[PDB]
Each structure stands twice: as C-alpha cells, then as structure tokens.
Design a protein around this ligand. Structure first.
Ligand SMILES: Cc1cc2nc3c(=O)[nH]c(=O)nc-3n(C[C@H](O)[C@H](O)[C@H](O)COP(=O)(O)OP(=O)(O)OC[C@H]3O[C@@H](n4cnc5c(N)ncnc54)[C@H](O)[C@@H]3O)c2cc1C
Ligand SMILES: Cc1cc2nc3c(=O)[nH]c(=O)nc-3n(C[C@H](O)[C@H](O)[C@H](O)COP(=O)(O)OP(=O)(O)OC[C@H]3O[C@@H](n4cnc5c(N)ncnc54)[C@H](O)[C@@H]3O)c2cc1C
Ligand SMILES: O=c1ccn([C@@H]2O[C@H](COP(=O)(O)OP(=O)(O)O[C@H]3O[C@H](CO)[C@H](O)C(F)(F)C3(F)F)[C@@H](O)[C@H]2O)c(=O)[nH]1
Ligand SMILES: O=c1ccn([C@@H]2O[C@H](COP(=O)(O)OP(=O)(O)O[C@H]3O[C@H](CO)[C@H](O)C(F)(F)C3(F)F)[C@@H](O)[C@H]2O)c(=O)[nH]1
Lengths: 391, 391
C-alpha cells in the first residue's frame, strides 16, 4: 500500500542518476521533487529563439571523464559530439594560449621555449615553495606555474571568482587545471569528452523518462515531506539540496559562491572567435565570456547573429542559489558538524546526503554521476533489495 | 588460360585501391608490381627500434576527408584515432599559432583582435589584388592573408620548398591552407580526420591481403612488361609511376620537387612539444621538423627518448623520387603533350594513368583514393565486366 519506494530531492545529475538506477534496475517507484520549474539543476539548457543556439542557462557545462563505466552509462541517454574544450585568456589587451603550456610561456616571455627550457624557467620561478608542501591555492599555484605567471593569470582571476585570500583557499582548486610543458591546449585531460548532441535538457529528460519515475516541479521538499513520508513510511530519502539549509543553518551558514549571468544576442556573426575567453585582469568585472555558437562547430547557425554570456561572481546570499563551496578552514569545521548531524539523520530517518550541495564538495557532472553510482551500488541497492542497514 | 586479369604499376594508395576493388568486387586476379622493396609508396611507415614510435619514412602523412564514401571505404582496412592535426610556425625565435587566424594575428601584431577587427585589418592589407583575380600563388596568398603576414610566413617558406618564383606557382597551392578569422587552429577543415590506429603499413597490407592480389616487390614494370603482357593479352594496365618517365622523357622532363629527410633519436623526452613545427625563416635550411611521439598522444612511449625528423626540399634529379609537381606554365604545356600520348596509349595498348605521379597532380591520400574509386566505377569495371571500351 506504499505509494513510493524512494524519495529524491533534486533533479540534478546526482538525483536523476539515483532515480534512474533504482527504477530500472530494482523495478521500484521513485518520486523526484524539484524546487525549480525545470529539471536538470544547473545543467539545464535552452535554445535561444533568434538563433536556435543552445544556451547553458546556469553557466557553461562541459562534460569530460576517464571513467569508462560512467562514460558507458551516460551514452545510454544521449550521444556526444567530438568537441574538445579549449580556453583562451585575456591579459593587458592580448589573448593568450591557456592553460599552462609552451604557447602561454612563449607569448608571455616573448620568445620560444623548448620543453626543457620551459621546465627550467618555471623551476627557477617556483623556488619559494615545493608542490608537495603546499597548504593552499596560492602555494600550490606558484609551485606549479611560477610567480610571474601566477600574478598575471591567477591573482586577478582568483580575486574576482572567490573574493577570498588565496592562502585560505584549497590547493585542490588550482589542480583542476592541467600543468603542461607542450603546445597542447586542451583544457581537460580526460579520456572521454564531448557535448550532448541534442542538448543537455534532452539528456536529462531521458534519464527521468521511465514511467516508474515521477517528477514534481515547483515543489519544495520541506513543504511536502510531512505528508508524503507517512504515505510511504519505509521509503528512504536522497537529499541533494544545501546541507546547511536542511538543518535550517543550526550551527551556522556555510560559505558559498554564486554567479550572475548576462546573456546578450549581438547583431554580429562572431564576437570573440572562440567558446570561452577568460578575463584575468581586474579592470573588468566579469570573470569570463561564453560564446555558445563555438560550442557546436559541427552545427551551422545564422552568421548575422551571435549569443554571448558574461559571468559574474559574488557571495551567495540567503535567496541566492549556491554554485561553489568556499571550503575555508572555518567552513570545513562547520562542515564536520553538519556531517555528524547528517550521519544521525541517516540512522534516525533514513536520509542520505549526496551531490555538490548535499556534501559541500566541488563536484563536476561526471564526478556527481560516479558518486551517485557508488551510493547506489554500496548503500541504496543493498537496502532496497536485501534490507541492509543504510549506514 | 590468361594468368592475370589486370596489371597494376605501383603499390601506393591509388594502385592498392584499384587492385582491391577489382579483386574483391569483380572476382578477378590482379598483379601488382612495385619498384621499391616495400608497399604503400610514400605512406610506408616503420617503427623506430629504440622507442617503438611509428616513423613516416617518406614524410609525415595525415589523413583527412569530407567524402563519406571514401571514409567508409578506408575504415574497412583500419581504425582511426581521434587525432586532430595542428601546426605551429617558427619565426624570429618565436613560435606562432598557425595557420591564418586570431591567434596568429594577435601574436604577430601585438594585441587582441576581434573577428571583425581582424577582417578589417586583413582587408586593408590585401588591397593590391582581389582573391578572384589571382593568377598565381603570390597573388592568391596576399589576397587572402595580406602582405605583412605573407612576407613573414609564406615568402621564406615557399622559397625553401619550391625554389621557384611565387608568381609562377599555382594559386591552388596556397588554398590548401584554411583561411580563418577564429581561434580555431585545426590545420585541416575536413569532416573526418585521424591516424591509422595500428600504423599505415598495416593499413596498406590489409588492402593487398586478398589472395587474388599478387604483389611483386623490387620489380620494375618496364623490365618485365615485355614478358608479362603476352601471358595475359587482354589484361589492361593501371600505371601510377611518373608520366614523363613512361614515355622516356620524349618531349622533355616535367619539373618535380623531392625531399631529403634527417631522422634522429634524441636522448630527451620531448624536443618541441608538438607534432609539426614549421620554419618560415631563411636562416635555417629545413622547412619543418616532425616529432612523431606527438602523432599518437593516446600512446605512451619512453620519456627519455624521442624521434624527430627534419625535412629538406630540392629539385628532383633523375635518380630522385618525385614528391611534388611544380606545375609552372612551361610544365603545364609539357603535361598537355603527355596527356595526348597517354590518351593514345589507352586506345592502343589499354594503359590507364592515375595517381600523383601518373597525372602530374597535387594529390593527397584521400584524393587519390577517391580518384581510384572513380576510375574503377566509370572506366575499369565497365570494361572488365561488360567489355566497354576504356575511353
Ligand atoms: C556554474 C556551474 C558550472 C558547472 N560547470 C560544469 C562543467 O563545465 N563540467 C562538469 O562536468 N560539471 C560542471 N558543473 C557541475 C554540475 O552542474 C553539477 O554538479 C551536476 O548537475 C550534478 O548534480 P548535482 O546533484 O550536484 O545537482 P546541482 O545542480 O548542484 O543541484 C541539484 C538540485 O537540487 C535541487 N534542490 C535543492 N534544494 C531542493 C529542495 N529543497 N527541494 C527540491 N529540490 C531541491 C535544485 O533545484 C537543484 O536543481 C558546474 C556547476 C555549476 C554550478
Ligand atoms: C612527402 C609527401 C607527403 C604527403 N603527405 C600527405 C598527407 O599528409 N596527407 C595526405 O592525405 N596525403 C599526403 N601525401 C600524398 C600520398 O602520400 C600519395 O598521394 C598516396 O600514396 C596516393 O597514392 P599514389 O598512387 O599517388 O602513390 P605514390 O606513392 O605518389 O607512388 C606510387 C608508387 O608507384 C610506384 N612506382 C613508380 N614507378 C614504378 C615502376 N616503374 N614500377 C613499379 N612501381 C612503380 C612507386 O614505387 C610508388 O610507390 C603526401 C605525399 C608526399 C610525397
Ligand atoms: O584563468 C584562470 C582560470 C582558473 N583559475 C583558478 O582555477 C580555479 C578553477 O578553475 P576552473 O576553470 O575549473 O573553474 P570552474 O568555474 O569550476 O570551471 C568552469 O569553467 C570552465 C570554463 O571553460 C569549464 O566550463 C569548467 F569546466 F571547468 C567549469 F565548467 F566547471 C578557479 O577557481 C581559479 O581559482 C585561475 O586562477 N585563473
Ligand atoms: O608555413 C607555410 C606553410 C605552407 N605554405 C604554402 O602552402 C603550400 C602548401 O602547404 P602544405 O602544408 O599543404 O604543404 P604540403 O607539404 O603538401 O603539406 C604537407 O605538410 C603538412 C604537415 O603538417 C601535412 O603533413 C600535410 F598534410 F599538409 C602534408 F602532409 F601534405 C606550400 O607549398 C607553401 O607554398 C607556406 O607558404 N607557408
């Protein structure tokens, strides 16, 4: 007589992966509850009416992974193009090859450097701190790319994105970018990469297309959990919303970063001649500019119009939507207290916590999907199928 | 009682395509005669013993095509990697993004140019001649990329490759390179591109693997045609050797360009950090340098050794192997006389002429394969199957 076998809070890639796996592999009924008027979370996309160009409404999303299982899993719901993401950096009125590589070095220092000459120069300029003993973002970056490059391509950019002292930011944030001594300027270094052939929304709709999956939009979990859970007493709950918001900020508010976007349809065919242009200087407010027509070069759009998007970073207010965890020393101490409360909620009320917002972690699409598969394999499936305790 | 149904002179991509199609689609026996001690022509490759790195013995060969039929045809004999060829240009001790694009323009002129600002600058600097009215290479290049770029990236390079006045060289030679106003630096602009997964030699061996195809190496056609053709009187002949050499240079010698190579195994892991580096300046003898480890970035070779190859251009002597047709006005006049003789040989002795050497034409791998398929479909197959006259 139980209506649902599982509750899922959030229709992001983590939530949809969980819902899809439980519904199709266990033949169970899943209710997905979404606060927003649309599914997919921040991966939600829409076609711009004038051009037909797919616009990433919540910031550019580029898919990439070296996990074969994840790669094989996502291909069940969408095809991928042969797109290879590349980023250019604007500094002092000049566009630079990016990231760290022979192109960047040769441009910034005025002459060509062999792979060995480049390693030497950097080694010299990284002498202050070694890579292994780097506590924070600043120590890590300087140890990897040297100081003169750090000031001209990291200092200003980091200040605009976090508004937090780099000595207080995690070192893992900078290791997201590949450190290279070749002319290769692929922004990612994963085995598999590409954009959804028919868009992200179509991809996300396929994952929730199963008839055993019900998605209720414009619905807040905390407004309806009092009535739904009695309808299905034994049904566990997978929560992917903000971790601190779940406990009503009892111990305090975790530091988040949010983003403002500026979408504009220009009466020209090409604005910058590339997909993403980073702006490292402080004389400009936005961190970077996206031109979505270059996301799909295999497609042919009108050559008299183009759609660009400028990106702005600031602290996430109470009514803002959290995009990036800050993870300072104070933030991590607060996180540990919420992790304890979360661990108690699992034992007391069968509530699991996952996703970027649910765990306060810097998660990409492929990392959240992989994390969702792990939670399913090791936690959810043994419980829903064999009755194994959730923790 | 006829031993062979077809004679093929040359085991290049043109010759092997012809042989493979006739043998498998018509169930006919084909004799392939090769002057060299190996098959594949200039596409022949070998693994360097110290590293295991595939070396293109007769110059770097990059496959690319927009022809779906050709693409589907070649995949029957080999797989292709996701390799995308890119070339960098060395000038005045600095490495430049190549070819014509926003990267090159921004580097050479000292500041960033928008796609519109770039079109303006070039337009100004191309004012002398318009693209449509370009008679030769020099007029075509200047009309496309402007003069200051022409002198710094085309003048010196063209002088080293052809040693012929650019006003006397074909305009089609420069249109091989994509003219761009974006940051895209893909050297080719075809739909399909990649390198043979298991090497070129394995690819070529598969095309001639059929039991109805016999390949005789170290055999010159003109030494054995007197005895072979009586053995198979009705068998046509597909000749892919030098057109003028076939008629013993009766009307004169066509102008060809040959190449000398300098292969070296260096005691370092990386020489230039990219596959191909062009040298546009005259203060260096070689036209470009290839580093073959970057041809296959999906592979992992030893990091203490690397194999490079320097390329030198000069006029093809009598004992040299012709690589590039010069095609001056005098050359084309001589070609017209050989085309008439060739047309007579087809009527009198059933001898077809194809390939880069057989037609004195600037042919790529995909263009020769496509040309071979056309000759098969429209000429050879109707003759060998229905008895239709060859011309
Ligand atoms: C600006 C930005 C850029 C990114 N770029 C990339 C990229 O380039 N490549 C890449 O691989 N990844 C990228 N990511 C990461 C990726 O978008 C997400 O991690 C991904 O969607 C994974 O799912 P998630 O569960 O963390 O969903 P999230 O989208 O982080 O959000 C999950 C959902 O929970 C819902 N929710 C929250 N609270 C409630 C509630 N109370 N009731 C109901 N629903 C609720 C929200 O509506 C939200 O839709 C980016 C993320 C951001 C923010
Ligand atoms: C230096 C160079 C670089 C190239 N790079 C590329 C590239 O990057 N991408 C691309 O798509 N294409 C490239 N090509 C083109 C390509 O290599 C050839 O066009 C291709 O092999 C097509 O076949 P072909 O018949 O023209 O054979 P070719 O190799 O031009 O030669 C055909 C064969 O005829 C044989 N032969 C000649 N005379 C006799 C005789 N009397 N008896 C017996 N045999 C004879 C020769 O041994 C030779 O092997 C390049 C060519 C050269 C020369
Ligand atoms: O020019 C730069 C670029 C980055 N950084 C530092 O690296 C950190 C992370 O860089 P990222 O590019 O990974 O930042 P993200 O916003 O998470 O990455 C998004 O932006 C990219 C746009 O090309 C991609 O869309 C993406 F995949 F990496 C992203 F979507 F997640 C930054 O926070 C900053 O501190 C710099 O310091 N300077
Ligand atoms: O820097 C340059 C480069 C090219 N050129 C002009 O374009 C003409 C053709 O350029 P190409 O690159 O097509 O010359 P090719 O030798 O036929 O091309 C070979 O070299 C390339 C190496 O990256 C590729 O391997 C290839 F495919 F294009 C090639 F094998 F055929 C040149 O003859 C020259 O006049 C220049 O003037 N300057």
């Amino acid at each position: 007589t139980a209506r649902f076998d599982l509750f899922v809070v959030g229709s992001g890639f983590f939530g949809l992966t969980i819902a899809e796996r439980v519904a199709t592999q266990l033949d169970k009924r899943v209710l997905v509850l979404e606060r927003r008027p649309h599914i997919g979370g921040n991966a939600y996309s829409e076609a711009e009416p004038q051009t037909g160009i797919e616009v990433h409404k919540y910031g550019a999303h580029l898919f990439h992974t070296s996990n074969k299982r994840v790669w094989d899993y996502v291909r069940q719901f969408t095809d991928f193009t042969d797109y290879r993401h590349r980023v250019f950096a604007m500094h002092n009125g000049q566009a630079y090859q990016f990231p760290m590589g022979l192109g960047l070095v040769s441009q910034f220092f005025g002459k060509y450097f062999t792979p060995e000459q480049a390693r030497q120069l950097i080694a010299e300029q990284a002498a202050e701190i070694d890579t292994a003993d780097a506590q924070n973002l600043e120590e890590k970056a300087i140890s990897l790319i040297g100081r003169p490059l750090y000031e001209a391509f990291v200092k200003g950019y980091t200040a605009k994105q976090w508004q937090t002292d780099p000595k207080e930011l995690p070192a893992a944030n900078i290791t997201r970018l590949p450190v290279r001594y070749t002319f290769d300027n692929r922004y990612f270094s994963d085995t598999y990469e590409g954009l959804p052939t028919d868009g992200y929304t179509a991809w996300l709709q396929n994952m929730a297309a199963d008839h055993r999956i019900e998605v209720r939009l414009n619905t807040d979990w905390f407004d309806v959990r009092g009535q739904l859970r009695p309808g299905s007493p034994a049904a566990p709950v997978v929560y992917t919303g903000p971790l601190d918001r779940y406990f009503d900020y009892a111990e305090g508010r975790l530091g988040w970063r949010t983003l403002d976007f500026e979408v504009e349809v220009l009466p020209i065919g090409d604005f910058q001649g590339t997909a993403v242009m980073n702006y490292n200087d402080l004389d400009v407010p936005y961190t970077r500019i996206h031109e979505f027509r270059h996301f799909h070069p295999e497609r042919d759009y009108r050559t008299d119009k183009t759609v660009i998007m400028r990106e702005y970073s600031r602290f996430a207010e109470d009514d803002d939507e959290p995009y990036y965890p800050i993870n300072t020393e104070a933030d991590r101490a607060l996180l540990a207290t919420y992790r304890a409360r979360a661990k108690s909620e699992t034992a007391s009320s069968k509530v699991l916590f996952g996703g970027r917002l649910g765990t306060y972690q810097y998660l990409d699409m492929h990392m959240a999907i992989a994390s969702a598969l792990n939670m399913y394999d090791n936690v959810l499936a043994p419980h829903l199928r064999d009755g194994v305790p959730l923790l």
